[PDB]
């Protein structure tokens, strides 16, 4: 059970998911119809429990995603890469939604989970690491599937918060670069904001090499691109 | 005969557990959302635990303490409505005015209109018969639930409370009603209570604020140091448009 190279499952995973579901559905974003959180938790567990944790497929999450698809109103989506804290504060203030503001994203944010064949329990010792063990693991596949659907459903103007205090604000291998940007629909307009740390000069900008790669992706998607830069965390918020 | 059909009251509502579950989700997510979260699985499990497999004529208030702790029947100050013998009117009034009766609390909403009881040695509801308060036992799980919920609802009342009473009855205040026996005597001291005695359209009222039964209520409220204002000679439509 301790054979993997990543940290083990969040031990109270089931309780945490269900509690977050209650908070989300009742307190944060109550919906047009009720959703049963026990059933959502049950579907989450069933996706991965008692399975080879290195044989995860997108299909395994079909039932779960169908119970709570990560869709948001047009013009209200926020994407981010390497700017977790900033992007979520920005989204909170402007009443916008990141992936972590969707039901399933809110449930899963910051958690780890995996199973073991022949066992009905979470593996709390270790779980597959995406580098050292396998990319076809249940944590990575969940976030890719969720990211795909989140990106696919974007409409009108979307925003991405990128880190202007890094050498490369755009990382082609990030989930944003690999899964989200390539799945935006034509006629979406994407605005990128390259935001730097207060009191520090930016390390990347809209005229840099990494942004060229992003524009290349978006041009092929027929996604309009407007890139802003040279602003600090304070100016952005 | 000593089997499942031995009681004089109607049996448990079929599929009680499904109904509870569905009502709890509806209530917490669509009726009164924005509020602090409640765990509906836990609430259902606590409700069942309170009575299942127990002597159906030995219910006590304490059997429901864990359920009430999960969702106390507390209403915001100034929004609470009591009623007696005016079920339809009181709930229409509460709906139109965005106020809350006992049946508008989480637990009151789950249980309204339902029946339930268990059977010793069984994990299931008795869907065949349940104890009747008058013919079998007062200390049954259905009656005791409404009694303890009523007490907690009255004890937590704050600021101005309103009661809707029936001006078309000879005695609008019945000391042996749940309102008269359990709710009024347990009102938080120093709240203020307004009573409205409402009569049916086109029928002259049968009771008023000056009658003997309202005097009995006044005496109870004086005991609780609760200020009392009573208004009468109103039809349903006059009351709703006040
Ligand atoms: C750009 O990314 C860097 C590197 O992750 C962020 O700096 C870290 O921020 C965390 C959380 O605030 C700190 O605990 C770390 O100590 C920081 N590490 C380093 C190397 O500085 C930075 O906040 C990001 N900037 C923006 C604007 O999002
Ligand atoms: C006062 O109480 C009477 C008696 O319960 C109510 O009249 C009953 O109303 C129910 C539901 O509307 C009917 O099914 C019964 O047939 C009625 N019975 C009688 C004797 O009329 C009346 O609605 C109450 N009035 C107010 C203002 O609440």
Numbering used by the authors:
A (entry chain B): 39 to 275
B (entry chain A): 36 to 277
Describing publication, verbatim:
Thus, the catalytic transformation of NAD+ involves the formation, via a ribooxocarbenium ion-like transition state, of a unique reaction intermediate that partitions between several competing pathways such as an irreversible hydrolytic process leading to ADP-ribose and a reversible minor pathway that governs the formation of cADPR. The L-shaped structure of bCD38 consists of two distinct domains separated by a cleft and connected by a hinge region. α-Helices are found mainly in the N-terminal and membrane-proximal domain of this transmembrane protein, whereas β-sheets are preponderant in the distal C-terminal domain.
Superposition of the E218Q mutant on the wt apo enzyme showed no differences between the structures (not shown) demonstrating the conservative nature of the mutation. This suggests that the active site geometry is maintained in the mutant and that the kinetic effects of the mutation (see below) are due to an intrinsic catalytic function of Glu218 side chain. Similarly, in the E218Q mutant, both Oε1 and Nε2 atoms of the amide group of Gln218 are interacting with water molecules and the Nε2 is at a distance of 2.9–3.0 Å from the oxygen atom of Ser185 side chain. Finally, the stabilization of the oxocarbenium ion intermediate by Glu218 can occur either by charge-charge stabilization or via a collapse to form a covalent acylal bond at its C1′-position.
